[PDB]
Amino acid sequence: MELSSLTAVSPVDGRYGDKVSALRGIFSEYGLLKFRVQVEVRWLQKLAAHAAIKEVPAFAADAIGYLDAIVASFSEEDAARIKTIERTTNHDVKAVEYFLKEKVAEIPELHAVSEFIHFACTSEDINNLSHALMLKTARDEVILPYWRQLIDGLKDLAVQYRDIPLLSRTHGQPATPSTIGKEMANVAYRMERQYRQLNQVEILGKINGAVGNYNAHIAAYPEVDWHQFSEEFVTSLGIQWNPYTTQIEPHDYIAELFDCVARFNTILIDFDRDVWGYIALNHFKQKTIMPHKVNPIDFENSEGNLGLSNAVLQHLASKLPVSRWQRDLTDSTVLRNLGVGIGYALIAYQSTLKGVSKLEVNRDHLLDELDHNWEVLAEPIQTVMRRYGIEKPYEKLKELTRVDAEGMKQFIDGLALPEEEKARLKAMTPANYIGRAITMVDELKHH
Amino acid sequence: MELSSLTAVSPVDGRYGDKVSALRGIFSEYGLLKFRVQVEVRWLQKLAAHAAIKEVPAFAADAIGYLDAIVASFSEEDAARIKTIERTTNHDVKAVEYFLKEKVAEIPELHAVSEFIHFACTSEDINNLSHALMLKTARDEVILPYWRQLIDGLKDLAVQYRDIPLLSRTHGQPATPSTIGKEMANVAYRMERQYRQLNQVEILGKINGAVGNYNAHIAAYPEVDWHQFSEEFVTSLGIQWNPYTTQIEPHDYIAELFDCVARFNTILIDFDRDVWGYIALNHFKQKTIMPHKVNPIDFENSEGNLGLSNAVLQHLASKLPVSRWQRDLTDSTVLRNLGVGIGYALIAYQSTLKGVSKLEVNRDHLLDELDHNWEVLAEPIQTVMRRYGIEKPYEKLKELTRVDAEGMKQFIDGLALPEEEKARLKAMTPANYIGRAITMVDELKHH
Amino acid sequence: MELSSLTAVSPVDGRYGDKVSALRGIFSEYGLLKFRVQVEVRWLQKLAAHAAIKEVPAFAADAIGYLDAIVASFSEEDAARIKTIERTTNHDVKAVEYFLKEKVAEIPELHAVSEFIHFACTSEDINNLSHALMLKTARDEVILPYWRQLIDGLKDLAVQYRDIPLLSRTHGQPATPSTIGKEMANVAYRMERQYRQLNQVEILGKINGAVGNYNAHIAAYPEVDWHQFSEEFVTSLGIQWNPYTTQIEPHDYIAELFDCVARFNTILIDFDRDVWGYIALNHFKQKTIMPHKVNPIDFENSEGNLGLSNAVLQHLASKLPVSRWQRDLTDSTVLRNLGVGIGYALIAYQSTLKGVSKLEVNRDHLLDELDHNWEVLAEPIQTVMRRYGIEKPYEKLKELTRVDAEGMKQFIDGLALPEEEKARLKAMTPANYIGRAITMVDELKHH
Amino acid sequence: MELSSLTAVSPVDGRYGDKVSALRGIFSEYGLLKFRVQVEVRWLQKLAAHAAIKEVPAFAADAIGYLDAIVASFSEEDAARIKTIERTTNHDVKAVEYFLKEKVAEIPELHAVSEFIHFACTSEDINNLSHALMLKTARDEVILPYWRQLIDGLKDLAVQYRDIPLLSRTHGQPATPSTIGKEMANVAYRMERQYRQLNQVEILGKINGAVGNYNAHIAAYPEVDWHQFSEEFVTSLGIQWNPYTTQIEPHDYIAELFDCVARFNTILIDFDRDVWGYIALNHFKQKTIMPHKVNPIDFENSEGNLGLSNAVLQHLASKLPVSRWQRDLTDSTVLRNLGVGIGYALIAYQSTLKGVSKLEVNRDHLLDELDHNWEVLAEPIQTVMRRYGIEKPYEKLKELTRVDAEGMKQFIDGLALPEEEKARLKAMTPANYIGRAITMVDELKHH
């Protein structure tokens, strides 16, 4: 059968193909070919711009324009042409070289130097730079924008429910109260940490020949400083330079990128699960469009896809940086999967965002539950007792802990405490015993 | 951009889409929908066949024929119709129910009982059975046939090179000789063990309602033995019955299937790596189509894809069997990836088979290397010395170990051994000191 | 600092050292040395018993007795002696050979053949057999007994609470009822499947020299059938024979053993989490020693340790079977960790057993919750409506779904159903709408 | 049996216990208890130093001295006392509180405020800070020093063999030459990147009560700024402040630390494997103490332990940051394993360092192999041909590629190239065709 969303083996291109359309122009073979073209064209352009390389004279504005067009207008038909050529070359990078030669055949100035396309390059010089451009593009145009949406989403929830009290759950049971907003704030803060880290990860690239020593370049042009050339070229692409490599770029930075994405994903899994739980406890209800139950399907879909994402991201991170001697070819096929781990993540991010838009706190339920857990006030009573030197505080409260407002008031009135403090204690309720929760939500914007 | 092999994010449907075409009819959404239809149709058919369920009278041969046709002729257009219906139902299983009702609307006998389609079923009753059929189909029609091809491939190599001596490598260095064939035989044997295990894995299915107790069935038909009904139905599909489940089939058997596939994959990774190594040592050369080097690209492609396969298979195996209480929905989206792990494996199996067809032993190199490692004969000399009570054998050989034929002959002649034994030792060479290697290759067919 | 439970880096020997004392005699270096001694002694014994090997005459009953004593009485002091000897040999297997020679030096009949200890053996011949004995011992004497305890524990809970109704939870929300016992039964059934599988896993061993071809054996005794000898020897130890290996036993069976242990562990993780959840919902309370909350700490400790266990078991399963060419030495140090993954599991098994002994159902809470979820009866009403041809059943119930007994009774009375069926429907309550749950618990003993 | 290095289940405390002695004072229960004491003592000290907390007056120099002594002199006997107390409290943190009260009972000034020990703290306030101190200590005193040793080790090899030519291996076969030193340099560079990253990882800590809102603190002292107090306290310990948490510190930073350690470990695995390979190819020989083979056992031991390390580190990194609601207790037992992953790493680091000290290049072998692979000069000949516009360079060389010096000289002399260039090409040999390799080794010190 022909390939369609219905027949695709993987749901990344199948059932969820529409959800990851942005990656089709980045991590697919079309994306790979698009960036290989960009790299090769820029390489030829630098050769021309370099005065010491006389065989490739400087390009005029028009010539530079024709080349820039080949790069900026690269279409599916162009990629299809490269694939056609590959049926004969049986070498994908070679297919791109021939493709560019065809595109330039009509321009005498460009056709005159067409044999300098890919000059002294090894296939990996082109490939690793293509991979870096794909990852950088994915990060700046896709991943970070979704992360900001999730972060702003959580912060919107934190602010909206900043003062909604919540009977906390430690080891699944009633504990010292907090507020819904504060619990959302905690997540936003963690996400922000990973956001800053992902944004600071270096995206590396190299260009130095067959095994990393510019052997071929120096043989042809011994007077040219190819080390300087390499650094200038990589940096001109908006990529950070990796001066020491073998035939391949080592891939350590890919592990760095994927490790931070995985950490963020883990935070989201934690969030999806906690929300699923709050819904199970009836703390959230369906947002108005009698309380209606909200189906957590969106958080479960996200959770499921986040697990798949980390599994793939994790594998590439740990396997890619291991390559026999000056390199084995196992990374070639593996690197065609850079967008798979990211694809699972994108599907999950959209699902969580969808689920978040359906959340509405069930204030009445939250408050009613709190009013049935006066045992939580044992904590504040103990610290006040301890402050005033009352002996065996924990022991006394243990004996005290059925507990209700009246039972607590009577216990407090019987304590050896100044009247002012007794009133302060008799003034608290599980619902208002939330500490600094609200102010902490308000301060999130300062971090 | 539209989905095509060029734009697909995942190479399973992208660059390697053609290599996994067999899975398009099994694990894709089309495959999922095809089996859901089979399940629903058979369920209706059993209801009709059951005399106690009067509301659904027995079907005549013609009616049964119309239904069997819906199942056997299920096309992409049918799946596309289900998807169209899903845009309105927003429920995939519900979409199948409506699809079947439409297909039967024209047949009065079938249309008369159309409301019994999916009777008392929960979505998972249909889904888990669809998953079992997909896995069973994949196993019997795709995975095992590739495994047999690899096994026969290794056995063909074992027999062909049964008597080609090899200087073994332990901790990467020269060791007691074996033969190329014997080393291939070792792999075939291990593969066979996993083949038998995969073939013995139970493929489970269930059908028992919302949470596994036939609540709905018993409510409508309290006189029918739904426990017996369930067992008969599942077994009639060629699936093994799982009597105790919650809303979902627990998925333990999926882990069992995937664990055996992963073990086989690990054996193949070991094989791909060893062959890559033998090629590096120049023990293999390009098969005739002066020795020509064989490029190990096929084994490297296999190795890379096997790592991805295990990562996915591993994740599903460990995550699927964990479902909150009577079930959470995280497995729904994850189960759409049953064919992803298998897809990576298939790509690898084909790559290894391709690589194997290019192998030719470099007999001259193997023999020359052996003739330069006479140190290996220290071992047989020591055991013979030990057999005849010659003291400090290891110490004496240590002092002896440059070593060549003449040096060994002289050492042997100076030993306190019966003449007959001295000749036996002086008759061995690294090339013929291969023990029982050849006979063991010949005996593989007995195991 | 010296090693003690307090200073141990790993909690397996540290905080939880007492919990895994059984493994100290199996997987530790003492255990490793104990089994190496057993293997070597039995090897010498078979050499003596073999008439064709004249240099080692048959042992008299007394001699056999002295040897059996060395094996059965192996003490920590003996192991300490081997370690002392290892300081000089810098080879652990060699240290055992010398140790045995010392032990036999006083017995003339044994000392006369002391140089045949380890005859023709390579270190791995001894090591792999030691590993098999350690795993077999651990399985039959430790792992399976704990599994049976857990299984019987779950079955005791299933029977005790066979008829305690439970409002099921699907995607964390109210669903068709079941009983506590049935939910426990589901777990017991899954555990039993893994128990049978673990018990059926083959524990393999080999003995065939440096690289697996009996080279050294044949060189010394060409008239002896060493292939038959090997099979008889391995099987005599109670181990299954692996005829085809390199220098090492491939380790596939270890992956098979660990994969089944991991599957069982995953089922237990699922159980620990679900119980943690039931406790959170107040379905369980502290068993009598007003309902008292039970702290789930035991299930959480189990859950945590099960994750660590699988991580270790998983790593050994996937890494051990990969060994470069005729073997690399990475498995030597890794195989010293066979008991680590098992140790984490044992700690968890004991924790879950401890937690289970504290469970008591909170019947009043379970029943009260059910009585507040009459929406669950929409399901049985729909199937009965469907059975009698009442149109748009789902649509009508949707409009109907606040819901209480009276609301349902009125809806049912207004249905076009025979009086007998209306009464059957009006007779059900969420508490009694449990389907076949109870009978299924009673039938568990038949599977 | 009692615990000893011989009976320990785990080799981290068993066979390799001596190799990780440094961790016994950090990650063991003794280490955990030592830091809990430090935390509690400092907390009491800050309470005293805070003027607003009148109930705990400022401590005099002598009192502060007595407290500092309890912290700095914490011994195994002290830890043993805490364990003894724990037999009664059945709560480890509570045991520390009682222990400190006993230690201060004799000092009236301290005993007078002894009830303020642990004031308003929840167990995790103490535990998370203890974990941060353990990780920071391990990083600065143990991990980084080993990393520097490995880095300096590789850099020493790079410089020593800076000009030793090497026939590179891509896909295991001959490729463009490099030098041994350059290949060592590549590793050093990668290690340095991870070193800088590990050193920049934030080590976080928190202190804010039961669920993170200072509820208890504010209840007792509403006039004190506990948010400021928390930040000052954590930072005073040399730890970075994490303002937003639940009952537990989220553990994201632990994943960050472990991810960087794992990346470094992966680089080392790559190094261990490559060296194992170079040894297999006879490029390295035993350093003088005729070429003697060096046994790679040290690199294999390192490789094996690095795999175990990553498996453990990986599990904690992905599992720790997931905690149900305000926290579940699964992290408590898991956090007792912080030193296990690190322990496996330390064993490996020492093994690689040991192996490195045995390496000596086999210059004669390296040069002889190069002199038999003149095919590598096809590359430089092609780029020079391309520079001068000679058509079909690749095609011509293909036809040319047996190849020796004479064959190349004749091919070059027949080319349409200026005489000067022909001589430059005829002047190269595989041994001197190393590009910029040497200069790149010399420049490593600048990065």
Contact B383 C119 (CB under 8 A): yes
Distance (Å, whole) CA D15 – CA C33: 12
Helix, strand, coil content of chain B in percent (nearest 5):
65, 5, 30
**Look-up: residue for tokens 């349902």?**
C408
Strand ranges inside A355-402, DSSP E:
359-361
Contacts of D210 (CB under 8 A, 6+ apart): A168, A170, A175, A176, A379, D122, D216, D247
d(CA C8, CA D29) in angstroms, rounded, equals 7
As given in the structure block, the two tokens for residue C386 are 């469907």
Considering only CB atoms, which chain C residues are within 8 Å of D27? 9
CA distance C128 to chain B (A): 16
Q: Are D275 and D358 within 8 A, CB to CB?
A: no
Q: Which of B17, B333, B337 sits opposite A301 (nearest CB)?
A: B333
Distance CA B296, CA B279 (A): 7
User: How far is A272 from D207, CA to CA, in rounded Å?
Assistant: 26
Instruction: Please give the backbone phi and psi of residue C284, each rounded to the nearest 5 degrees, phi first.
Output: -120, 150
Domain D374-434 in the same topology as domain D2-117: no
- Enclosing H/E stretch for D176: strand D173-179
Number of other CB atoms surrounding residue A27 within 10 Å: 31
B308: nearest CB among A80, A337, A339 = A337
Number of other residues whose CB lies within 10 A of the CB of residue A228: 9
Nearest to D434 among A215, A428, A440 (CB): A215
The experimental technique used to determine this model is: X-ray
Chain A residues lying within 8 Å of C279, measured CB to CB: 172-173
Find which of B383, B432, B441, B446 to mutate to test the C interface (most C CBs within 10 Å of its CB): B383
**Is A171 noted as a catalytic residue in this protein?**
yes
Cβ <8 Å between B172 and D295? no
Helices and strands in chain C: count of H runs, count of E runs = 21, 6
CB contact under 8 A, B220 and C120: no
In chain B the first and final C-alpha atoms are separated, in Å, by 54
User: Can you tell me the distance from the alpha carbon of B185 to that of B162, in angstroms, rounded to the nearest whole number?
Assistant: 9
Q: Which residues contact C145 (CB under 8 A, 6 or more apart)?
A: none
Q: Which residue from D191, D220, D178 is spatially nearest to D55, judged by alpha carbons?
A: D220
Closest by CA position to B46, among listed B163, B141, B125: B125
Q: What is the DSSP string of B35-87?
A: HHHHHHHHHHHHHHH-TT-TTSPPPPHHHHHHHHHHHHT--HHHHHHHHHHHH
Residues 6 or more apart whose Cβ sits within 8 Å of residue A310: A262, A265, A266, A341, D318
Cα–Cα dist B132/B35, whole Å: 9
Of A4, A29, A331, the CB nearest to B304: A331
Q: Which residue of D has its CA nearest to C320?
A: D304
Q: Minimal Cα–Cα distance from D294 to chain B, Å?
A: 9
Look at D1 and C337 and tell me if their CB atoms are within 8 Å: no
Angle made by CA atoms B10, A40, D440, in degrees to the nearest 5 = 100
Q: Count interface pairs C-D at CB distance under 8 A.
A: 188
Cα-flanking dihedrals φ and ψ of residue A367, to 5°? -70, -40
Tokens of A306: 């986040």
Query: Least CA distance to A292: which residue of chain C?
Result: C402
Q: Please check whether residue D197 is in contact with residue D256, taking contact to mean a CB–CB distance below 8 angstroms.
A: no
Structural contact between residues B361 and A334, judged by C-beta atoms closer than 8 angstroms: no
How far is the C-alpha of D53 from the C-alpha of D59, rounded, in Å? 12
Give the chain A residue nearest C292 (alpha carbons): A402
Pull the structure tokens for residue A6.
């219905």
Cβ–Cβ under 8 Å, residues D280 and D335:
no
Q: Which two tokens stand for residue A416?
A: 């050896």
Angle at D340 between CA D338 and CA D345, to 5 degrees: 110
Distance CA B344, CA B12 (A): 7
Angle between helices B297-319 and A297-319 (to 10 degrees): 140
> What length is written for chain A?
447
Helix (H, G, I), strand (E, B) or coil at C179: strand
* Beta carbons within 8 Å of A306's beta carbon, 6+ residues apart: A265, A266, A268, A269, A272, A344, A345, A348
Kind plus residue range of the DSSP H or E element containing B258: helix B252-280
- B-chain CB neighbours of A347 within 8 Å are 333
Tell me the residue ranges of DSSP E strands in A99-206: 165-170, 173-179, 204-205
Give dist(CA D154, CA D184) in Å, integer.
6
d(CA A113, CA C112) in angstroms, rounded, equals 86
Architecture of the structural domain at A118-373+435-447 = Up-down Bundle (1.20)
Query: Contacts of residue B190 in chain C, CB cutoff 8 Å?
Result: 244, 250, 252
Contact B346, B306 (CB under 8 A): no
Query: Using a CB-CB distance cutoff of 8 angstroms, which residues of chain D are in contact with residue C333?
Result: 11, 300-301, 304-305, 347
Contact A202, A253 (CB under 8 A): yes
CA nearest to B169 within chain C:
C326
Contacts of B309 (CB under 8 A, 6+ apart): B261, B262, B265, B341, B342, B343, B344, B345, B348
Of B3, B25, B347, the CB nearest to A5: B3
Does B171 contact D277 at a Cβ distance shorter than 8 Å? no
List C-alpha distances in Å: B61 to B44, B58, B64, B68.
14, 10, 5, 10
Residue appearing with tokens 């050994």 = C316
> Cβ of D1 and C24 within 8 Å?
yes
Tell the burial category of B21 from Cβ atoms under 10 Å away from its Cβ (0-12, 13-18, 19+): middle
Positions of B marked catalytic: 171
Residues whose CB falls within 8 Å of the CB of residue A72, separated by 6 or more in sequence, listed in order: none
Q: Chain C interface, mutation test: which of D1, D10, D123, most C Cβ atoms within 10 Å?
A: D10
Q: Do A28 and B9 touch (CB under 8 A)?
A: yes
Nearest to D344 by CA among D308, D314, D317: D308
SS3 assignment, position B296: coil
Interhelix angle for C252-280 vs C297-319, to 10°?
160
User: Measuring CA to CA, which residue among D210, D231, D73, D207 is closest to residue D129?
Assistant: D207
DSSP string, D13-45: TTTTGGGGHHHHTTTSHHHHHHHHHHHHHHHHH
Q: Which residues of A touch B10 (CB under 8 A)?
A: 10, 12-13, 337, 339-340, 343
Residues 6+ apart with CB under 8 A from A374: A403, A404, A405, A407, A408, A429, A430
Please, what sign has the CA dihedral across residues B431, B433, B435, B439?
A: positive
Query: Would the CB atoms of B280 and D402 count as touching at under 8 Å?
Result: no
Q: How far is D3 from chain A (nearest CA, A)?
A: 33
In chain B, count of helices (H) and strands (E)? Answer: 21, 6
Whether C189 contacts C447, CB under 8 Å: yes
Q: How far apart are CA A328 and CA A246, in angstroms?
A: 11
Task: Provide long-range contacts, Cβ within 8 A and 24+ apart, for A149-152.
Answer: A149/A349, A149/A353, A150/A191, A150/A268, A150/A349, A150/A352, A150/A353, A151/A188, A151/A191, A151/A192, A151/A195
Question: What string of DSSP letters covers C1-63?
Answer: ----TTT-SSTTTTTTGGGGHHHHTTTSHHHHHHHHHHHHHHHHHHHHH-TT-TTSPPPPHHH
Distance CA A14, CA A347 (A): 12
CA-CA distances (angstroms) from residue C216 to A333, B168, B261, C47? 44, 14, 36, 15
- How far apart CA C33 and CA C93 sit, in angstroms, is 9
Distance separating alpha carbons of residues A110 and A106, to the nearest angstrom: 8
Q: How far apart are CA A116 and CA D382, in angstroms?
A: 12
Tell if the CB–CB gap between B315 and A308 is shorter than 8 Å. Answer: yes
Contact across the interface for B277 and D172, Cβ inside 8 Å: yes
Q: Which residues pair with C241 in a beta bridge?
A: C205
* Catalytic residue IDs of D: 171
E strand map for D329-378: 359-361
Q: Chains near D, with 3+ CB pairs < 8 A?
A: A, B, C
Q: Are C38 and C129 in contact (CB under 8 A)?
A: no
- Per-residue DSSP letter, B432: T
Give residue limits of the domains in chain D. 2-117, 118-373+435-447, 374-434
B279 vs D402: CB contact, 8 Å cut-off?
no
Q: Is A335 marked as binding a ligand?
A: yes
Distance CA C250, CA D3 (A): 32
Alpha helices in B201-225 (DSSP H): 215-220
User: Where does residue A415 fall: left (phi above 0), alpha (psi -120 to 50 degrees), or beta otherwise?
Assistant: beta
Cα of D172 to nearest chain B Cα, Å: 5
User: What does this entry list as its resolution, in Å?
Assistant: 2.0
Set of chain C residues whose Cβ sits within 8 Å of the Cβ of D340 = 9-10
According to DSSP, residue D55 is labeled: T
In this structure, the dihedral spanned by the alpha carbons of residues C82, C88, C89 and C90, taken in order and rounded to 10 degrees, is: 90
A246 is in an annotated binding site: no
Which residues from chain B sit within 8 angstroms of residue D300, using beta carbons? 171
Q: What tokens were used for C89?
A: 């040999």
Q: For residue D95, with 0-12 CB atoms within 10 Å meaning exposed, 13-18 middle and 19 or more buried, which class applies?
A: buried
From residue D152, alpha-carbon distances to A342, D212, D443 in Å are: 37, 44, 15
Residue with tokens 């340790």: C305
Q: Which two tokens stand for residue A86?
A: 């590959």
**How many CB atoms neighbour CB B156 within 10 A?**
13
Q: What is the C-alpha separation between A143 and B94, in angstroms, rounded? A: 34
Comparing alpha-carbon positions, the chain C residue that sits nearest to D310 is C315
**A403-412: Cβ within 8 A, 24+ apart:** A403/A374, A403/A375, A403/A377, A403/A378, A404/A374, A405/A374, A405/A429, A407/A374, A408/A374, A408/A377, A408/A381, A411/A381, A412/A381
| CA atoms of C294 and D424, how far apart (whole Å) | 85
Closest residue to C296, CB basis, from A172, A279, A295: A172
The pair of three-digit structure tokens given for residue A126, joined into one six-digit string: 């082109």
Minimal Cα distance from A343: which residue of B? B9
- Give the phi and the psi of residue A113 in degrees, each rounded to 5: -115, 15
Residue with tokens 């805070």: D50
Tokens of A160: 């909206």
Burial classification of residue B392, based on how many CB atoms lie within 10 Å of its CB (0-12 exposed, 13-18 middle, 19 or more buried): exposed
Catalytic residues of C: 171
Q: What's the CA gap between B101 and B111, in Å, rounded?
A: 7
Write the residue in C276, C330, C339 that is nearest to D328 by C-beta.
Answer: C276
* Residue C58 CB coordination number (10 Å): 12
User: Which chain C residues have any C-beta within 8 angstroms of a chain A C-beta?
Assistant: 169, 171-173, 276-277, 279-280, 290, 293, 295-297, 300, 402
Q: How far apart are the first and last CA of chain C?
A: 54
Q: Which fold has domain B2-117?
A: Fumarase C; Chain B, domain 1 (1.10.275)
**CA geometry: angle at A157 spanning A153 and A160, to 5°?**
135
Give the tokens for residue B289. Answer: 């189509």
DSSP classification of residue A17:
G
DSSP code for B20: G
Neighbours of chain C (3+ CB pairs under 8 A): A, B, D
- In the CATH hierarchy, which fold is given to the domain comprising B374-434? Ribonucleotide Reductase Protein R1; domain 1 (1.10.40)
The pair phi, psi for residue B211, each rounded to 5°, is -130, 15
Which chains lie within 8 Å of chain A at 3 or more CB pairs, if any? B, C, D
Do residues D133 and D31 make contact, with C-beta atoms less than 8 angstroms apart? no
CB atoms within 10 A of CB B199: 13
The size of the A-B interface in CB pairs under 8 A is 188
